[PDB]
């Protein structure tokens, strides 16, 4: 275990801070920052698709590319 | 027009059929739900848990529509797949018989399946109505 998988409310504040205005947004991208490792990043990205925010490109399991809503 | 089952995609057909049954809750439940492996070779139980049977019963109904007469043993062979039998090559063996049989027994009383001659189970007159209504409902969802 290399940390950054445990659920913290302090991190949930900083997810919404760093959500908007980015080129690359995916499961591949967020894990490079040591955020919610693995599957909890997919759940974090599932929140950001609901109320606009970040809009999709690909819609496959394991290949989930997104881009900011202009 | 030409409203048939084939205009609606096969994977998308079952989604509208599943929600249709859960509103009523009159397709009946056997008793073996979530005390279940699903097949003769399958390590993890159903991930869906709730619903589940309504997905299975919908996919059984649409296959009985296309073909003349489907049985219990063939449905087990169709749904069933691969194994991991220790350190040997992966084989193929039938799925759970008790789940797929009580789909066919329960759907008879609801009003879909009919007893056919020779062997197997064909479609009723009222069974073709509910298949087309949900197909027409799925046509409205797309269009």
């Amino acid at each position: 275990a290399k940390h950054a998988v445990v659920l913290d409310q302090d991190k949930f504040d900083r997810i919404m801070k760093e959500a908007p205005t980015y080129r690359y947004v995916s499961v591949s991208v967020l894990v490079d920052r040591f955020k919610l490792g693995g599957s909890l990043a997919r759940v974090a990205l599932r929140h950001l698709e609901n109320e606009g925010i970040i809009k999709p490109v690909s819609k496959h399991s394991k290949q989930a590319i997104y881009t900011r809503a202009t | 027009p030409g409203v048939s089952v084939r205009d609606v995609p096969a994977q998308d057909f079952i989604n509208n059929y599943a929600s249709f049954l859960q509103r009523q809750g009159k397709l009946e439940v056997p008793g073996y739900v979530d005390i279940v492996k699903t097949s003769a070779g399958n390590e993890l139980p159903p991930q869906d848990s709730e619903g589940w049977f309504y997905k299975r019963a919908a996919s059984v109904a649409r296959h009985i529509y296309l073909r003349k007469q489907v049985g219990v043993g063939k449905l087990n062979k169709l749904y069933g797949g691969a194994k991991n039998r220790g350190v040997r090559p992966h084989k193929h063996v039938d799925a759970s018989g008790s789940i797929n049989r009580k789909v066919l027994q329960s759907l008879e009383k609801l009003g879909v399946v009919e007893i056919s001659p020779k062997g197997g189970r064909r479609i009723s007159d009222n069974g073709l109505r509910d298949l087309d209504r949900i197909a027409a409902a799925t046509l409205e969802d797309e269009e």
Partner: protein, 206 residues
Amino acid sequence: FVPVELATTIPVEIQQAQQEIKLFNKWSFEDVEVKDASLVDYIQISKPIYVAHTAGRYANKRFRKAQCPIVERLTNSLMMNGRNNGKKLKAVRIVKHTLEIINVLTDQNPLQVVVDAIINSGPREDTTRVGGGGAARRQAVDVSPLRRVNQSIALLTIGAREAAFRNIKTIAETLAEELINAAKGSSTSYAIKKKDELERVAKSNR
């Protein structure tokens, strides 16, 4: 222009592509000049094809590997390792996802990044092991023209798959980065380093 009416209903977005522009999947296959004498003719953008999964009577005569479009070269190269031998459906799905990444990054036609990557990972000089008694002295022999293209496409996929060996960054993200680094010569990607480290060996024995 003019969506044609039949009994069967096709979406308009598909018919927008028809008649006017012979596209790839959605975006344009046209333009994309190579601009590097040696790789001209052998790298073929003039052939317009939609899907990268043809029948293929390629490897028969000798120089018929040139006829194959460069999009199909990348699909076949990813099939190595016995787990992934065969299964072009799995590769063809991945090759679409690599091109979607490049479209997002600074707009651009993604084949212009792919073609420039083939130029910047093809060695100029590759030494052949000459005997001359027994020892492994390496004489400086030159490289042209399919050997520059065939090595370059292989070295991209070796660098791509090794980067995604026990990793969240699955093949499509790594392969897209390798082409950007080669197109915009950064001296970081291993498509360039493995080419540059052989340069280099020829000049020592010259």
